[PDB]
Structures are given as C-alpha cells and as structure tokens.
Design goal:
The complex is a heterodimer of chains A (166) and B (170).
Chain A: E1 3-7, H1 8-21, E2 27-36, E3 39-47, H2 62-73, E4 80-87, H3 97-109, E5 114-118, E6 130-135, E7 141-149, H4 152-158
Parallel strand pairs in A: 1-3, 1-7, 4-5
Antiparallel strand pairs in A: 2-3, 2-4, 5-6, 6-7
Chain B: E1 6-9, H1 11-23, E2 33-39, E3 44-52, E4 55-57, E5 65-67, H2 69-82, E6 87-93, H3 102-110, E7 118-122, E8 132-140, E9 143-149, E10 151-153, H4 157-166
Parallel strand pairs in B: 1-3, 1-10, 6-7
Antiparallel strand pairs in B: 2-3, 2-6, 4-5, 7-8, 8-9
The chains are: A alpha/beta (166), B alpha/beta (170).
The structure holds zinc ion (ZN).
Zinc ion (ZN) binds at residues 55, 86, 88, 96, 99 of chain A.
Modified residues (N-acetylserine) (chain B): 1
Function (chain B): Acts as a regulatory subunit of the 26S proteasome which is involved in the ATP-dependent degradation of ubiquitinated proteins.
GO molecular function, one term (chain B): metallopeptidase activity
C-alpha cells in the first residue's frame, strides 16, 4: 500500500542497462501483473533502443515493442506492460516535466502504470539508488515502496557469486 | 595450445536460465534451450547475457528436434540494437547433463557464431559445485567430441551491486 515488487532479473537488467548507457539516459518497459490495487509485480523488463530525441514517448518504438512482446510470448512470457523504467545517471531519482508527460501517456494506456527511475552512477555496492512513481489522481507525483520478490531457487542461484562467503 | 582455457558466467545468465525453465513450466525429462551472449575473442570466454528459444523435442526420439532459425536471427538483431558489444557466442540448455543430440545441435549454432560455439549447461535444479558446465566441440584421436572448460561465476559492478542487494535479508 502501495508496493512495487521487482524480481531478480528485472533489477539486474535495469542496473546493467543503466550502467551500459552511461553517460546517457536509457529506457525500457516493465513486464508483470497488477496483483491488486496496492500491489504491482514486475517480473521482467526489456530495453528499448536509444533514440536521438532522448527519453520521451517518442523513444517508445512500438514496432520494436510489438516484436519483442511477440517473441517473448513464444517462449513463455506473456505478461502485461505494467510500466516503464529509465535512468538518471548521476542526478538522482525523480520525474522531470518531460517524464511526467511520458508517464501520463502510459497512464492513458493503463491507469495503473508505474514509472521506475534508477541512478546507475550513484548506485554503488551496499546502496541501490532507485524509486517508483505514479501520478497523483487529478500534476504532482508520489513515491511507491519498492520490494524485491525472490524465490528459494533464485536465492540459491545468487549464492554462487561469492560462494566462500556463505 | 591456443584453446579457450576457461569460462565466466554472469549471475543474470543463471537467473535468466532459471526463469526461462520456470516460465515455460519445463518438467520431467524435458529441457529448455536458449542462446548465450558475451565475448569469446580471448582464451577466457565471458558469458554476460542470454535469451530463450522456442524448442521442441521428444526423448522418445533422440534425433528429432526443431531449432527455430528465424527466431534466432530476429531476436539477435534486436539484441544488437541494445548492445553491440554482447555477441552471439553459443547456446545453453537446462540439462542437467549432456544429451545425445547436443553435438548435432551445436553444429547448427556454428552458423551463427564467429567463435567455436560455447555450450553452457545450467542446472536449474541445482543438485549437488557450480550449477554450470561449459563445453566447446573439438576433434580428437578422428571424430567430434565436447571439451569440458572450467567455469566461474563473475559479476561486473552493476550486477555485483544488484546481487548484494538481493542477497541482503540473508
Ligand atoms: Zn527522467
């Protein structure tokens, strides 16, 4: 109330993508399900290509998106777009004027859409800089709590990274 | 020798293989199959990304299977648009062991890789060391066999940060 649950691959993909795009902003779509009114589940994400005109509605390439969505469907991933993520490399997590316009477009498609913002430069070991937003219902925005969903199998798989530590 | 000596795998690849296996509800004797991405220009092969493939086989017919060619090309070309540095270096499957058709399947991947294709088996059930086993196809004394390469799990900074964060509360 309200909470966005972000899965393991989703977080890692957002960090990986944000870091790779530095010093430019990057953007992509979040997949999952609206569980109830107070709960969004992000199970996966995919990157959108860089476009000249920055991170805006114009960078949402709906051909690429439709193609990706279709190919994901063929391999067992048929989750709804539940929002979008983008990076603010070095300048923290919030929504600019343009970001609010983009979020509004996602809101018109689906009133439950969530905007996730990550800072790949200020994200360091022991501190992930990230936040989730919706627009106030009729233009200000508010933060949602972010939690991480993680199965027992995922936890065990993660434990292989620095094994001699567990 | 100038042969590849070892392989490193990113945590994201392990997690991606798992999520693939789980989301297709792969069960019983079946395996899931996909493509791996990264850098194989050196004696250390670095595996840093992956994607799932549609793939059907029956174990009651150990030489019948369908590898979706268009899917590979189409998905790879979208991957290139995001990151040209991560190249198609081979394929993965859930095993948990080598299967009889693997050398044949591996041959088809030669068509898509610049390098000798890396096969990565990710044991998503994680029974009993590392859940990975890595192979390249070679000739020996003369026919074709898989050469087993040692694996380690290694993360770049962003992943290191993500994994540590995920693995708090534990
Ligand atoms: Zn922004």
């Amino acid at each position: 109330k309200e909470t966005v649950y972000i899965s393991s691959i989703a977080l890692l993909k957002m960090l990986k993508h944000g870091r790779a795009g530095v010093p430019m902003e990057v953007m992509g779509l979040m997949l999952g399900e609206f569980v109830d009114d107070y709960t969004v589940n992000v199970v996966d994400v995919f990157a959108m290509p860089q476009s000249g005109t920055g991170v805006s509605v114009e960078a949402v390439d709906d051909v690429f998106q439709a193609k990706m969505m279709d190919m994901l469907k063929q391999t067992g991933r048929d989750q709804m777009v539940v929002g979008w993520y983008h990076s603010h490399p070095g300048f923290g997590c919030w929504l600019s004027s343009v970001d609010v316009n983009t979020q509004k477009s996602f809101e018109q498609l689906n009133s439950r859409a969530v905007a996730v913002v990550v800072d790949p430069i200020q994200s360091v070991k022991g501190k992930v800089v990230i936040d989730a937003f919706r627009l106030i219902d009729t233009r200000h925005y508010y933060s949602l709590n972010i939690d991480y969903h993680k199965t027992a199998k995922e936890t065990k798989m993660l434990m292989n990274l620095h094994k001699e530590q567990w | 020798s100038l042969q590849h000596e070892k392989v490193t795998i990113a945590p994201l690849v392990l997690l991606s293989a798992l999520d693939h296996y789980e989301r297709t509800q792969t069960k019983e004797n079946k395996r899931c199959v996909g493509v791996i991405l990264g850098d194989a220009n050196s004696s250390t092969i670095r595996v840093t990304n992956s994607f799932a493939l549609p793939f059907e086989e029956d174990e009651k017919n150990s030489d019948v299977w369908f590898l979706d060619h268009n899917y590979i090309e189409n998905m790879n070309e979208m991957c290139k648009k995001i990151n040209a540095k991560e190249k198609l270096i081979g394929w993965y499957h859930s095993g948990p062991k080598l299967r009889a058709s693997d050398l044949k399947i591996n041959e088809l991947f030669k068509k898509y890789t610049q390098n000798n294709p890396l096969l990565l088996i990710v044991d998503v059930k994680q029974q009993g060391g590392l859940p990975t086993d890595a192979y390249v196809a070679i000739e020996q004394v003369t026919e074709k066999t898989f050469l087993h390469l040692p694996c380690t799990i290694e993360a770049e900074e962003a992943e290191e940060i993500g994994v540590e964060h995920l693995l708090r509360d534990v």
